[PDB]
Amino acid sequence: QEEHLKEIMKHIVKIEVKGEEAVKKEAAEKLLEKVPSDVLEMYKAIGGKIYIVDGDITKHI
């Protein structure tokens, strides 16, 4: 019983607050991480690059 408390404890109690907007930047970067890096180099070489907007994707220049 004393053993189990530890695992649950770590998962729920986030020690510090990253911040309101940091999490957003951190989330996307982690996402692209899982794709093999070599793919990203191929994308840049053929030109345009992905940029992350924040608002309604429907309205961008």
* Contact call for residue 51 and other proteins (CB under 8 A): yes
Question: Measured from the CB of residue 1, what is the shortest distance to other proteins in angstroms?
Answer: 10
Residues 8-37 contacting other proteins, CB under 8 A: 25, 29
Question: Measured from the CB of residue 32, what is the shortest distance to other proteins in angstroms?
Answer: 8
Instruction: For residues 50 and 48, give the distance between their C-alpha atoms in angstroms, rounded to a whole number.
Output: 7
Instruction: For residues 59 and 61, give the distance between their C-alpha atoms in angstroms, rounded to a whole number.
Output: 7
Beta-carbon contacts of 60 under 8 Å, excluding residues fewer than 6 positions away, are: 53
Residues that bind other proteins (CB under 8 A): 2, 25, 29, 40, 44, 48-53
